[PDB]
Amino acid sequence: MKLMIVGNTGSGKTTLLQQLMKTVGIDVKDWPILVLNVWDFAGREEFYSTHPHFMTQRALYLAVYDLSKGQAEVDAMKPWLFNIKARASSSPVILVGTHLDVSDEKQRKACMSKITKELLNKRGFPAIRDYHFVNATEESDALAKLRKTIINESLNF
Amino acid sequence: MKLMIVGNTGSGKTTLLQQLMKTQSATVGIDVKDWPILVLNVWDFAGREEFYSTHPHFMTQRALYLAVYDLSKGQAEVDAMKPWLFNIKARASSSPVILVGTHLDVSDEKQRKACMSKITKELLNKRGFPAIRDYHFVNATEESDALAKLRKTIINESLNFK
Ligand SMILES: Nc1nc2c(ncn2[C@@H]2O[C@H](COP(=O)(O)OP(=O)(O)O)[C@@H](O)[C@H]2O)c(=O)[nH]1
Ligand SMILES: Nc1nc2c(ncn2[C@@H]2O[C@H](COP(=O)(O)OP(=O)(O)O)[C@@H](O)[C@H]2O)c(=O)[nH]1
Ligand SMILES: [Mg+2]
Ligand SMILES: [Mg+2]
């Protein structure tokens, strides 16, 4: 299923691949011939960063959902939270509802009540550190706050 | 730090990242970007099947490797492969590996004998390196018989690996 292209930088890995199929640290492509999931690594540092330890222990999560689709999308977050918990116990999560610009207040408050009650303080869900509602298509106050929360969480982990 | 962006397709994950950073599928399944602020290694998952695909079981136990070196730099590059091979071994003792020397077009005939000799006697059938299935020498920039043989080896081993 996966084809990993490894070796040192400048050896021709990306060039070889586009020729077979006929810098970014890690490039992930599908190759239909049987479909192979191809992982193109720039060098040793990038391969090392995929060790299961970093992948499962050293990660912080943005769980993103479309608020304009209403509280069922918040429900759609539960399977994600169980999966995230199973990858790591200690994985902190920030929930982000997008499409705020095309959401009603009934939806925003319902989703928040849902979040507050059903997701916010539960074992074994991950620790959900904050939640945000944003128009993801533009710069805004709320998006800048989300940006700061992501920084604060990365530093304090 | 890794930042893993998850959720279902079309929820705005890639749009949200682009906005945050301003400071077959229609979309890439997994996109991996560095974000300098502290550098965040950001992994943007299109959806559930893509996140699933990164389970450590699939990452470490369901992977075939193309181990690439520059043959115009000579037998020292074949030596450079040994650390890679120990590393691949540590992920799964069973990982199949195909070795490929590029830059054939700017290498000597002797360069290459030395590499093949080196590969043959130091890497080929060795407890515990991984399972080195084949080796090839190619100009990676063009179609060739040699590249077509490599393409075939990849199909063959992949199918055998399944
Ligand atoms: N002449 C020649 N140049 C090559 C060959 N393979 C790669 N290159 C050149 O090597 C350089 C590095 O290639 P790249 O594909 O970026 O290497 P990567 O870091 O391993 O992904 C590029 O300028 C390629 O065009 C080859 O077989 N022959
Ligand atoms: N109106 C609006 N559209 C959004 C928002 N976030 C994402 N979109 C749109 O949703 C569609 C899918 O976004 P994309 O980033 O591809 O979602 P992904 O599949 O989760 O990566 C695009 O047409 C975006 O412009 C938002 O907050 N408001
Ligand atoms: Mg490359
Ligand atoms: Mg996307």
Short mmCIF file of C-alpha atoms and ligand atoms in Angstrom, two decimals:
data_model
loop_
_atom_site.label_atom_id
_atom_site.label_comp_id
_atom_site.label_asym_id
_atom_site.label_seq_id
_atom_site.Cartn_x
_atom_site.Cartn_y
_atom_site.Cartn_z
CA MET A 1 0.00 0.00 0.00
CA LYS A 2 2.66 2.69 0.85
CA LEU A 3 5.79 3.42 -1.18
CA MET A 4 8.33 5.39 0.83
CA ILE A 5 11.03 7.24 -1.09
CA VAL A 6 14.02 7.78 1.10
CA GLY A 7 17.63 8.91 0.84
CA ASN A 8 19.47 12.18 1.31
CA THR A 9 18.45 15.55 -0.09
CA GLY A 10 19.34 16.19 -3.74
CA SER A 11 19.73 12.53 -4.59
CA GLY A 12 16.86 12.72 -7.18
CA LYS A 13 13.91 11.25 -5.25
CA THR A 14 11.24 13.72 -6.45
CA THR A 15 12.64 13.67 -10.01
CA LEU A 16 12.64 9.86 -10.08
CA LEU A 17 9.06 9.72 -8.85
CA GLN A 18 7.65 12.15 -11.44
CA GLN A 19 9.37 10.09 -14.10
CA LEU A 20 7.98 6.86 -12.73
CA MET A 21 4.57 8.45 -12.67
CA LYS A 22 4.77 9.69 -16.25
CA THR A 23 11.56 21.51 -1.13
CA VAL A 24 8.53 20.12 0.73
CA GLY A 25 9.80 17.91 3.59
CA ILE A 26 7.17 15.25 2.90
CA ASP A 27 5.08 14.89 -0.24
CA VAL A 28 2.14 12.41 -0.19
CA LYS A 29 0.70 11.32 -3.54
CA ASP A 30 -1.45 8.56 -4.94
CA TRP A 31 -0.02 6.61 -7.86
CA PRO A 32 -2.54 4.64 -9.99
CA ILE A 33 -1.04 1.78 -11.97
CA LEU A 34 -3.35 -1.05 -7.96
CA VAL A 35 -3.01 2.37 -6.27
CA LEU A 36 0.13 3.09 -4.23
CA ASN A 37 0.17 5.76 -1.59
CA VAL A 38 3.55 7.34 -2.26
CA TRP A 39 5.44 9.18 0.45
CA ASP A 40 8.34 11.27 -0.86
CA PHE A 41 10.80 12.26 1.95
CA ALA A 42 13.27 15.13 1.50
CA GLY A 43 15.88 13.60 3.84
CA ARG A 44 16.67 11.89 7.19
CA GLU A 45 15.14 14.59 9.42
CA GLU A 46 11.76 14.32 7.65
CA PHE A 47 11.73 10.50 7.79
CA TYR A 48 12.60 10.62 11.50
CA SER A 49 9.67 12.93 12.17
CA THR A 50 7.31 10.10 11.13
CA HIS A 51 8.44 7.77 13.95
CA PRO A 52 5.18 6.60 15.70
CA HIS A 53 6.41 8.31 18.87
CA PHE A 54 6.28 11.81 17.29
CA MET A 55 3.19 10.98 15.29
CA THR A 56 1.13 9.80 18.28
CA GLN A 57 2.76 11.48 21.30
CA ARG A 58 3.93 14.84 19.90
CA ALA A 59 0.74 16.20 18.20
CA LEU A 60 -1.93 18.80 18.88
CA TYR A 61 -5.27 18.68 17.10
CA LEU A 62 -7.64 21.04 15.31
CA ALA A 63 -11.01 19.29 14.99
CA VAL A 64 -12.79 21.30 12.25
CA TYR A 65 -16.55 21.22 11.45
CA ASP A 66 -19.01 23.23 9.36
CA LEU A 67 -21.23 25.11 11.79
CA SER A 68 -23.64 26.07 9.00
CA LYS A 69 -24.68 22.36 8.80
CA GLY A 70 -25.92 22.61 12.41
CA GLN A 71 -25.63 20.52 15.53
CA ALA A 72 -25.37 17.17 13.73
CA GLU A 73 -21.84 18.31 12.69
CA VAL A 74 -21.02 18.64 16.36
CA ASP A 75 -22.26 15.03 16.71
CA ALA A 76 -20.03 14.11 13.75
CA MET A 77 -17.15 15.26 15.96
CA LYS A 78 -17.61 12.36 18.48
CA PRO A 79 -16.16 9.68 16.20
CA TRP A 80 -13.17 11.95 15.55
CA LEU A 81 -12.61 12.54 19.27
CA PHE A 82 -12.64 8.76 19.99
CA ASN A 83 -10.09 8.22 17.18
CA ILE A 84 -7.89 11.08 18.47
CA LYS A 85 -8.02 9.65 22.00
CA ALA A 86 -7.02 6.22 20.68
CA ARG A 87 -3.97 7.67 18.82
CA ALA A 88 -2.94 9.43 22.06
CA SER A 89 -4.42 9.69 25.49
CA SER A 90 -2.77 13.09 26.14
CA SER A 91 -3.61 14.74 22.80
CA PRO A 92 -5.05 18.24 23.33
CA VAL A 93 -7.77 19.35 20.91
CA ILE A 94 -9.14 22.74 19.79
CA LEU A 95 -12.60 22.57 18.15
CA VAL A 96 -13.22 24.90 15.29
CA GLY A 97 -16.55 25.56 13.69
CA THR A 98 -16.12 27.25 10.28
CA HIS A 99 -18.77 28.85 8.00
CA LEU A 100 -19.83 31.23 10.78
CA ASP A 101 -20.65 33.80 8.04
CA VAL A 102 -23.45 31.51 6.73
CA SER A 103 -24.66 30.19 10.14
CA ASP A 104 -27.63 31.41 12.19
CA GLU A 105 -27.51 32.35 15.90
CA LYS A 106 -29.84 29.42 16.67
CA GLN A 107 -27.13 27.19 15.16
CA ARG A 108 -24.18 28.83 16.87
CA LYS A 109 -25.83 28.65 20.34
CA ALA A 110 -27.14 25.10 19.83
CA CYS A 111 -23.65 23.93 18.77
CA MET A 112 -22.11 25.60 21.75
CA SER A 113 -24.66 24.09 24.18
CA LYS A 114 -23.90 20.73 22.60
CA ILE A 115 -20.12 21.28 22.90
CA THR A 116 -20.40 22.56 26.48
CA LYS A 117 -22.54 19.64 27.65
CA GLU A 118 -21.53 16.69 25.51
CA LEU A 119 -17.87 17.10 24.55
CA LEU A 120 -16.25 19.45 26.98
CA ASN A 121 -15.50 17.57 30.08
CA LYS A 122 -15.38 13.86 29.33
CA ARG A 123 -13.14 10.87 29.76
CA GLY A 124 -12.15 9.30 27.45
CA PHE A 125 -12.40 12.11 25.01
CA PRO A 126 -9.24 14.17 24.53
CA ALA A 127 -8.72 17.31 26.59
CA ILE A 128 -10.48 19.93 24.58
CA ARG A 129 -8.56 23.11 25.30
CA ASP A 130 -10.82 25.68 23.60
CA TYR A 131 -13.43 26.14 20.92
CA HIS A 132 -13.78 28.79 18.26
CA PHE A 133 -16.32 29.90 15.58
CA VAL A 134 -14.77 31.54 12.50
CA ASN A 135 -15.30 32.57 8.89
CA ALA A 136 -12.25 30.70 7.64
CA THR A 137 -12.06 32.62 4.36
CA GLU A 138 -10.89 36.00 5.77
CA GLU A 139 -8.81 37.71 8.49
CA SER A 140 -10.95 38.53 11.55
CA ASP A 141 -10.70 39.01 15.32
CA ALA A 142 -11.92 35.48 16.00
CA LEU A 143 -9.41 33.86 13.63
CA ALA A 144 -6.56 35.86 15.27
CA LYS A 145 -7.68 34.51 18.64
CA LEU A 146 -7.66 30.97 17.26
CA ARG A 147 -4.15 31.68 15.99
CA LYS A 148 -3.05 32.80 19.47
CA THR A 149 -4.69 29.75 21.09
CA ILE A 150 -2.73 27.50 18.71
CA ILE A 151 0.51 29.20 19.73
CA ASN A 152 -0.23 29.11 23.48
CA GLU A 153 -1.06 25.39 23.28
CA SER A 154 2.04 24.43 21.26
CA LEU A 155 4.28 26.28 23.76
CA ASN A 156 2.46 24.90 26.82
CA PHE A 157 2.28 21.21 25.96
CA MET B 1 5.32 20.27 17.40
CA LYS B 2 2.88 18.63 15.00
CA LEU B 3 -0.47 20.27 14.29
CA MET B 4 -2.95 17.73 13.01
CA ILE B 5 -5.97 19.21 11.21
CA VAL B 6 -8.84 16.71 11.10
CA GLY B 7 -12.54 16.65 10.27
CA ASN B 8 -14.64 15.54 7.34
CA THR B 9 -14.12 16.56 3.75
CA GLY B 10 -15.36 20.06 2.77
CA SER B 11 -15.43 21.40 6.36
CA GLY B 12 -12.84 24.16 5.53
CA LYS B 13 -9.60 22.58 6.91
CA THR B 14 -7.32 23.66 4.01
CA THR B 15 -8.99 27.12 3.77
CA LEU B 16 -8.63 27.62 7.56
CA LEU B 17 -4.86 26.69 7.46
CA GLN B 18 -4.19 29.04 4.55
CA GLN B 19 -5.88 31.83 6.50
CA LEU B 20 -4.03 30.96 9.73
CA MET B 21 -0.72 30.93 7.85
CA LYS B 22 -1.29 34.35 6.12
CA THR B 23 0.62 35.89 8.95
CA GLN B 24 -9.03 10.19 -7.20
CA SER B 25 -9.64 13.16 -4.89
CA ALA B 26 -10.24 16.80 -5.85
CA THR B 27 -7.88 17.71 -2.99
CA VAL B 28 -4.61 16.32 -1.66
CA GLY B 29 -5.28 13.53 0.86
CA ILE B 30 -2.52 14.54 3.24
CA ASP B 31 -0.69 17.82 2.92
CA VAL B 32 2.34 18.45 5.13
CA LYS B 33 3.59 22.02 5.62
CA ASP B 34 5.97 23.79 8.00
CA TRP B 35 4.58 26.88 9.67
CA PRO B 36 7.24 29.21 11.19
CA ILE B 37 6.01 31.28 14.14
CA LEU B 38 8.57 27.85 16.88
CA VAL B 39 7.97 25.81 13.75
CA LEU B 40 4.75 23.85 13.55
CA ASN B 41 4.80 20.77 11.34
CA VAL B 42 1.26 20.88 10.02
CA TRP B 43 -0.57 17.84 8.73
CA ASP B 44 -3.82 18.64 6.92
CA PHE B 45 -6.04 15.53 6.47
CA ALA B 46 -8.70 15.61 3.78
CA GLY B 47 -10.87 13.24 5.82
CA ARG B 48 -11.29 10.04 7.83
CA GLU B 49 -9.78 7.57 5.33
CA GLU B 50 -6.62 9.66 5.17
CA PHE B 51 -6.21 9.89 8.93
CA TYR B 52 -6.80 6.16 9.25
CA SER B 53 -4.05 5.52 6.66
CA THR B 54 -1.53 7.05 9.11
CA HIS B 55 -2.14 4.52 11.87
CA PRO B 56 1.37 3.34 13.00
CA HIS B 57 0.50 -0.23 11.85
CA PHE B 58 0.19 0.94 8.19
CA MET B 59 3.03 3.44 8.46
CA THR B 60 5.55 0.91 9.75
CA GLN B 61 4.25 -2.55 8.71
CA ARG B 62 2.63 -1.83 5.28
CA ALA B 63 5.43 0.14 3.55
CA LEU B 64 7.72 -0.71 0.63
CA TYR B 65 10.86 1.47 0.25
CA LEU B 66 12.66 3.00 -2.63
CA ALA B 67 16.12 3.80 -1.29
CA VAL B 68 17.66 6.44 -3.64
CA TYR B 69 21.35 7.55 -3.95
CA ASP B 70 23.41 9.59 -6.41
CA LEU B 71 25.71 7.31 -8.27
CA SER B 72 27.86 10.09 -9.65
CA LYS B 73 29.02 10.68 -6.14
CA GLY B 74 30.37 7.14 -6.06
CA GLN B 75 30.67 4.27 -3.60
CA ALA B 76 30.66 6.62 -0.58
CA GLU B 77 26.94 7.13 -1.42
CA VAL B 78 26.37 3.42 -1.27
CA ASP B 79 27.93 3.64 2.21
CA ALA B 80 25.47 6.50 2.97
CA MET B 81 22.71 3.98 2.44
CA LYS B 82 23.66 1.82 5.49
CA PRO B 83 22.19 4.23 8.07
CA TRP B 84 19.03 4.40 6.02
CA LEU B 85 18.82 0.63 5.90
CA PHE B 86 19.29 0.23 9.71
CA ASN B 87 16.55 2.81 10.13
CA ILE B 88 14.19 1.01 7.75
CA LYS B 89 14.95 -2.21 9.61
CA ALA B 90 14.00 -0.61 12.93
CA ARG B 91 10.50 0.25 11.47
CA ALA B 92 9.92 -3.36 10.31
CA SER B 93 12.49 -6.14 9.98
CA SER B 94 10.38 -7.32 7.01
CA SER B 95 10.29 -4.05 5.00
CA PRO B 96 11.03 -4.70 1.34
CA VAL B 97 13.62 -2.27 -0.13
CA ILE B 98 14.54 -1.49 -3.73
CA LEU B 99 17.85 0.38 -4.15
CA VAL B 100 18.14 2.91 -6.93
CA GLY B 101 21.22 4.80 -8.06
CA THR B 102 20.32 7.97 -10.05
CA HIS B 103 22.58 10.24 -12.18
CA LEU B 104 23.72 7.26 -14.28
CA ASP B 105 24.06 9.73 -17.21
CA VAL B 106 26.90 11.59 -15.41
CA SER B 107 28.66 8.59 -13.77
CA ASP B 108 31.68 6.55 -14.99
CA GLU B 109 31.36 2.87 -15.95
CA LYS B 110 33.84 2.24 -13.12
CA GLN B 111 31.81 4.27 -10.66
CA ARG B 112 29.25 1.86 -10.92
CA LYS B 113 30.99 -1.39 -10.89
CA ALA B 114 32.34 -0.10 -7.58
CA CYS B 115 28.75 0.56 -6.43
CA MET B 116 27.41 -2.71 -7.71
CA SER B 117 30.33 -4.59 -6.09
CA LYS B 118 29.70 -2.68 -2.85
CA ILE B 119 25.94 -3.31 -2.97
CA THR B 120 26.56 -6.97 -3.78
CA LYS B 121 29.04 -7.76 -1.03
CA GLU B 122 27.97 -5.37 1.78
CA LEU B 123 24.23 -4.84 1.54
CA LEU B 124 22.60 -7.59 -0.46
CA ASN B 125 21.84 -10.60 1.75
CA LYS B 126 22.35 -9.34 5.22
CA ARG B 127 20.95 -10.04 8.59
CA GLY B 128 19.73 -7.40 9.79
CA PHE B 129 19.27 -5.05 7.01
CA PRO B 130 15.78 -5.17 5.57
CA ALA B 131 14.74 -7.28 2.60
CA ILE B 132 16.65 -5.71 -0.32
CA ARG B 133 14.68 -7.03 -3.27
CA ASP B 134 16.46 -5.42 -6.19
CA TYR B 135 18.79 -2.73 -7.40
CA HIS B 136 18.73 -0.42 -10.41
CA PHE B 137 20.74 2.35 -12.05
CA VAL B 138 18.82 5.02 -13.93
CA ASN B 139 18.98 8.50 -15.44
CA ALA B 140 15.94 9.69 -13.44
CA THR B 141 15.20 12.51 -15.83
CA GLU B 142 14.19 10.45 -18.89
CA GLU B 143 12.16 7.43 -20.03
CA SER B 144 14.44 4.42 -20.58
CA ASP B 145 14.49 0.62 -20.60
CA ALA B 146 16.17 0.86 -17.21
CA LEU B 147 13.38 2.98 -15.73
CA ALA B 148 10.70 0.65 -17.18
CA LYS B 149 12.42 -2.33 -15.45
CA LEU B 150 12.33 -0.42 -12.15
CA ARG B 151 8.60 0.42 -12.65
CA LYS B 152 7.92 -3.29 -13.15
CA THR B 153 9.95 -4.28 -10.01
CA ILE B 154 7.78 -1.89 -7.99
CA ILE B 155 4.59 -3.46 -9.25
CA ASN B 156 5.91 -6.95 -8.62
CA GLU B 157 7.04 -6.38 -5.05
CA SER B 158 4.02 -4.34 -4.18
CA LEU B 159 1.74 -7.13 -5.31
CA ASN B 160 3.86 -9.73 -3.49
CA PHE B 161 3.80 -7.52 -0.35
CA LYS B 162 -0.05 -7.44 -0.39
N1 LIG C 1 21.68 14.45 -14.75
C1 LIG C 1 20.79 13.94 -13.84
N2 LIG C 1 20.29 14.78 -12.93
C2 LIG C 1 19.40 14.32 -12.01
C3 LIG C 1 19.01 12.90 -11.98
N3 LIG C 1 18.14 12.73 -10.96
C4 LIG C 1 17.99 13.93 -10.39
N4 LIG C 1 18.75 14.87 -11.02
C5 LIG C 1 18.85 16.28 -10.68
O1 LIG C 1 19.17 16.27 -9.30
C6 LIG C 1 18.65 17.42 -8.64
C7 LIG C 1 17.93 17.05 -7.34
O2 LIG C 1 16.75 16.30 -7.64
P1 LIG C 1 15.52 16.18 -6.64
O3 LIG C 1 14.64 15.35 -7.51
O4 LIG C 1 15.09 17.50 -6.14
O5 LIG C 1 16.21 15.48 -5.40
P2 LIG C 1 15.57 15.11 -3.96
O6 LIG C 1 15.95 16.11 -2.92
O7 LIG C 1 16.12 13.75 -3.64
O8 LIG C 1 14.06 15.10 -4.12
C8 LIG C 1 17.70 18.03 -9.69
O9 LIG C 1 18.38 19.10 -10.32
C9 LIG C 1 17.49 16.94 -10.70
O10 LIG C 1 17.15 17.36 -12.01
C10 LIG C 1 19.64 12.02 -12.98
O11 LIG C 1 19.38 10.80 -13.02
N5 LIG C 1 20.50 12.60 -13.85
N1 LIG C 2 -18.48 30.82 3.40
C1 LIG C 2 -17.47 30.10 4.00
N2 LIG C 2 -16.91 29.14 3.24
C2 LIG C 2 -15.93 28.36 3.74
C3 LIG C 2 -15.46 28.56 5.12
N3 LIG C 2 -14.49 27.68 5.33
C4 LIG C 2 -14.36 26.96 4.19
N4 LIG C 2 -15.22 27.38 3.25
C5 LIG C 2 -15.41 26.87 1.89
O1 LIG C 2 -15.65 25.48 2.00
C6 LIG C 2 -15.22 24.78 0.83
C7 LIG C 2 -14.28 23.60 1.19
O2 LIG C 2 -13.12 24.09 1.91
P1 LIG C 2 -11.78 23.19 1.98
O3 LIG C 2 -10.78 24.09 2.65
O4 LIG C 2 -11.44 22.58 0.69
O5 LIG C 2 -12.37 22.05 2.99
P2 LIG C 2 -11.60 20.64 3.44
O6 LIG C 2 -12.01 19.58 2.47
O7 LIG C 2 -11.95 20.54 4.87
O8 LIG C 2 -10.15 21.03 3.28
C8 LIG C 2 -14.46 25.84 0.04
O9 LIG C 2 -15.32 26.18 -1.05
C9 LIG C 2 -14.19 26.97 1.03
O10 LIG C 2 -14.08 28.29 0.44
C10 LIG C 2 -16.12 29.61 5.89
O11 LIG C 2 -15.76 29.80 7.06
N5 LIG C 2 -17.11 30.34 5.27
MG MG C 3 12.50 16.06 -3.29
MG MG C 4 -8.59 20.04 2.29
#
